[PDB]
Design a protein around this nucleic acid. Sequence first.
RNA 1: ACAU
DNA 2: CGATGT
Length: 136
Amino acid sequence: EEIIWESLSVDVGSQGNPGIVEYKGVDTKTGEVLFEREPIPIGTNNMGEFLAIVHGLRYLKERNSRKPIYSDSQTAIKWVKDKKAKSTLVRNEETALIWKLVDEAEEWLNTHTYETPILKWQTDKWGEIKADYGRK
RNA sequence: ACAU
DNA sequence: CGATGT
Ligand SMILES: [Cl-]
Ligand SMILES: [Cl-]
Ligand SMILES: [Cl-]
Ligand SMILES: [Mg+2]
Ligand SMILES: [Mg+2]
Ligand SMILES: [Rb+]
Ligand SMILES: [Rb+]
Ligand SMILES: [Rb+]
Ligand SMILES: [Rb+]
């Protein structure tokens, strides 16, 4: 219904899908960029959306912050809930890095706890999430 | 269909 | 127009 402004918003950006993937997290209220991942040569939109949420969880936990996380990705929210990124991307030498990071993010989820609400950013009502890359 |  | 996902 209403935006929870006291929150962290995350999003993927890419060049191609599959293609070069990056992600970032921003303060929903101010747009301040709080973290940005260096581009990964090949990944998918959904893998990057998943990594962005898990990075947000780790970022907030390290800082003892109870803020929720907004994501625009129905898929990645479910993958985090399930602790399992069900990507179709081939696992090969070219995709090794993204898959390593996804595997490590799942491993983190399986070894840590959090109460962080992971909320759907309602793009249809609120416009683009504040972490968006402005590329579409 | 919906979400990217 | 193409792609990734539930
Ligand atoms: Cl990562
Ligand atoms: Cl909340
Ligand atoms: Cl959702
Ligand atoms: Mg997104
Ligand atoms: Mg975006
Ligand atoms: Rb902590
Ligand atoms: Rb964009
Ligand atoms: Rb979107
Ligand atoms: Rb589709």
